[PDB]
């Protein structure tokens, strides 16, 4: 079966940390499932919502040889996939996007098209309560929380020079199950630092953070 081989591929790519190949293999499985006539409409909604959520919660494109080449080949990509393009390919594919739960579309709008650090918590607040009722949701909690805080941090890198950790972390503390403690928030920030999305200065005795250039 080509289905099981793709299924297996989505698992592999999920544990590898190559999320773009994960949602890609998902799409390759979905086309198959759509050809198939054992189609329940609910599997469609679950799979489509799963796929789209995978794309939303995908890490922002680091700009980096390429060791994904045989995987690109295996999956019939001809170039390195892009987060923005994956999301776009899903949005413009009505076979998928017509089955996507509207909570994920609301979510997409909030973090991709109308992001504001000064409004995110209030907007995400009850939405995440709804999303926490979804069965496809829990396993993307970690990468989704990671991408929004990343959004929060670069937006912060441009708003602040020197700011208290209290105001910074309170600002980066997302609602509902995307909540992280202060030490995790400081680590997530140090992570964004080493990925060169940000240049900082951290555990100053003054309990402050200093965003650089």
Residue numbers in the entry: 278 to 341, 345 to 493
From the paper:
The PCI domain is a conserved bipartite domain comprising the helical bundle (HB) and winged-helix (WH) subdomains initially identified as the principal scaffold for the multisubunit 26S proteasome lid, signalosome (CSN) and eIF3 complexes. Yeast eIF3 contains two PCI domains, one at the N-terminus of its eIF3a/TIF32 subunit and the other at the C-terminus of eIF3c/NIP1. PCI domains are known to be protein interaction sites. a/TIF32, the largest subunit of yeast eIF3, has been implicated in building the core of eIF3 by interacting with c/NIP1 and b/PRT1, two other large eIF3 subunits. Taken together, we propose that one of the key roles of the a/TIF32-PCI domain is, besides building the eIF3 core, to contact mRNAs in a non-specific manner and promote their delivery to and/or stable binding on the small ribosomal subunit.
The crystal structure of a/TIF32276-494 was solved by single wavelength anomalous dispersion using a selenomethionine (SeMet) derivative and refined to the final resolution of 2.65 Å. The asymmetric unit (AU) is composed of two molecules of a/TIF32276−494, which corresponds to a solvent content of 45%. Although the first molecule in the AU (chain A in the pdb file) is almost complete, the second molecule is only partially defined in the electron density map. The crystal structure of a/TIF32276–494 consists of two intimately connected subdomains; an N-terminal right-handed helical bundle capped by a C-terminal winged helix (WH) domain. The helical bundle (HB) is composed of three pairs of antiparallel helices with structural resemblance to tetratricopeptide repeats (TPR). Interestingly, residues 337–362, which form the loop and the helix connecting helices 3 and 4, are not present in the structure of any of the known PCI domains. The winged helix sub-domain shows the canonical α-β-α-α-β-β topology with an N-terminal elongated helix, which is kinked at the beginning. Most notably, R431 of helix 7, E392 of helix 5 and R363 of helix 4 are tightly linked by hydrogen bonds locking these three helices in place. R363 and the adjacent K364 together with R431 contribute to a positively charged surface on the concave face of the protein, proposing a function for this region in mRNA recruitment (see below). The results indicated the formation of a complex with the stoichiometric ratio of nearly 1 (0.944), the dissociation constant (Kd) of 158 nM and a relatively large enthalpy change of −10.23 kcal/mol.
